Structures are given as C-alpha cells and as structure tokens.
Design a protein around this ligand. Structure first.
Ligand SMILES: O=C(O)CCc1ccccc1
Length: 327
C-alpha cells in the first residue's frame, strides 16, 4: 500500500499533465494492481517556484516532479547538447537520443542525486511577439522571455534583450508589458493565453530554432525503499519508450495550438529553410563556445554532438510503442 506525490508547474488540463503525466501515473497504478496511488499536484499547488522542483524531489518535499532542466543552469550541462540551435528535426528522435545519452553519460554523473524516469524535448521553439518578426533585426530592442541559459545566449545573439523567467509567469509578464514577446513551442501557448495577449508568431521550416530538455524525476529514497516488484513496476512504465511518447505527444500538441492562432487571425510568419540561414549565421557560434566550455571541464562536447546526431538518425517510428499498461 503506497501513496506517491507528483508535483508540476502547469494546470491539470495542460497538454503534458493530461496526455503525458496522467497517462504515466495511471500506467504505474494499473501496472501495480492498485498497490501504488499517485496524487498529482499541478500549478505548484504544494508551494515554491518551478525552478525549485528538482530540489523538491531531492529533499523529499514531493516524490516525483516534472521540471525544465534549464531552470537549474550549471547543473546538467550534458542535456544542453539538445538545446543547441537548429539541432533537432524530430522531437521523438531527440527524446530517443536523449534517453540513450542520459543512460550512457548522465545517470551516474550529473544526475546521480535523483532517479530519472523520463528525458524529452518539446516541439519546435519559436517566437510570439507584440510586433511582427520576419528577420533577426526585427528583434532589436525587444524584451524576449527565455527559459534556459542557451536560449538566453541565442536571444542575445539575434539582438533581443533576454528576460529569464519560469514559463507560467509569461501571461502576467505579457499583460503588464514587462516583456514584448516570448519563446515557447506552440503546444503550451493555449494554457498561457499567448494567442490572446499577442497577435504575431514566427515559426521555422526544417530544424527547430531550439527546444528545451525536461526530466520526470523521483526522490531516490522513495524509489529505493519500495519493494523490488514495485520498483520493477515504476521501471516498466518509465525510460526509453516513455521518453519517445512524452516528446511525441508534446510535439503533436503543437498542431491544435497553432490552429487556434490561425482561426483568431493572428499573423504567423513561416521562415523558409533558405531564410533560416540568416538566423543560423547569428546563433551557430554557440556550437563552438559550448564545445569549448565542455572541453574546459574535460568533456568531449563534439563527441556528444556527434553521438546525438547519430542516435537521432538511427531512430525509427517502430520504436514509438508506449501506451496503456496491463495490470
Ligand atoms: O520555455 C520555458 O521556459 C519552458 C518551456 C515549456 C514548454 C512547454 C511546456 C512546459 C514548459
């Protein structure tokens, strides 16, 4: 008889909570034959700010959290291989690569203090602004919200003034004119009333401008102290197939979100793969600086980039098998 608490930073009817986390939690409960119940607390209901979620899991405030890796910068630098500009073409492929590389490089190193249940990226990160944006110079003198240190670097290099804040604060920040626009993928715009608060959006054909890494993470003591058969339940509903499903589900939610912006008459600029080269010219120096920072810490940054590309190429849609579990 086991009760676990799950804490996260978006509303219960948001896309990841409802179609990813509730499916995972329901899977663990069904698979445990009712021996595990998971209480789900949305919108930081148990207190704190979203950046604090990783430490809430480590300190046992919550048993399980979904959080943005980038909200605790300087801690988990290996994840940042997926946050390099124009790196990712397919969120399922990247989430597959992210799980393999997590297990190879990160599990017993930068993530040793926590049990990692899932690793994924969102759909293409893109702009949502009070004024139309077609080329990098349009961002000059705009305050743009970012959620990671690599996204703040990207924003600086295209001539934006980056404002770092957790994603739920965007709505108030836009409404009060603290920011002129934000980075996010499409899927989460709906829950944040972004199409209501701004009339312009800039998306990119081909590779994503950026995407942020997430984890689903669990207090080590809470996991280790389960009986071994209940440990095997958590593991059976977690890891590689789960990670591909989390990234795929979240990426797929871009579509219905974009359609809301279209149907209201918001302006959407679609940057062609040709016109993206002007953007790439300003942001691709991050590859060289990031590799140098990793090399300074004795990490082969370029080998991490090469292995990410190789794993994303090796992903095949037949690996996307995650669904509702047997008991
Ligand atoms: O950009 C951020 O600060 C976070 C990104 C994010 C996107 C989609 C769901 C939750 C968080």
């Amino acid at each position: 008889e086991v009760t676990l608490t799950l804490h996260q930073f978006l509303p219960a009817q948001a896309n990841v909570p409802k179609d990813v986390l509730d499916v995972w939690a329901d899977n663990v409960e069904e698979a445990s034959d009712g021996r595990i119940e998971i209480e789900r607390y949305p919108s930081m209901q148990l207190g704190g700010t979203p950046p604090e979620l990783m430490d809430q899991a480590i300190d046992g405030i919550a048993d399980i959290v979904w959080t943005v890796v980038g909200y605790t910068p300087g801690r988990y630098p290996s994840t940042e291989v997926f946050e390099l500009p124009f790196m990712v073409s397919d969120a399922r492929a990247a989430s597959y690569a992210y799980w393999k590389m997590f297990e190879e490089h990160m599990k017993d190193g930068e993530f040793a203090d926590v049990k990692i249940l899932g690793t994924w990226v969102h759909g293409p990160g893109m702009f949502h602004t009070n004024k139309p944006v077609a080329v990098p110079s349009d961002l000059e003198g705009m305050k743009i919200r970012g959620g990671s240190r690599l996204v703040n670097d990207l924003l600086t290099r295209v001539g934006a003034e980056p404002i770092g804040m957790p994603v739920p604060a965007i709505s108030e920040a836009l409404s009060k004119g603290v920011i002129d626009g934000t980075t996010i993928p499409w899927e989460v715009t709906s829950a944040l009333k972004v199409p209501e608060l701004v009339g312009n959006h800039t998306e990119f054909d081909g590779p994503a401008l950026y995407n942020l890494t997430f984890v689903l993470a669990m207090n080590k003591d809470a996991y280790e102290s389960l009986p071994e058969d209940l440990q095997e339940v958590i593991d059976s509903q977690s890891g590689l197939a789960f990670s591909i499903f989390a990234g795929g589900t979240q990426a797929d939610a871009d579509g219905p979100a974009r359609q809301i912006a279209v149907d209201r008459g918001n302006n959407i600029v679609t940057v062609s793969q040709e016109d993206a080269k002007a953007w790439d010219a300003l942001v691709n120096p991050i590859y060289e600086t990031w590799v140098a920072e990793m090399n300074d810490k004795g990490i082969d940054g370029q080998a991490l980039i090469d292995e990410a590309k190789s794993l994303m190429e090796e992903y095949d849609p037949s690996m996307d098998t995650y669904g509702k579990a047997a008991a």
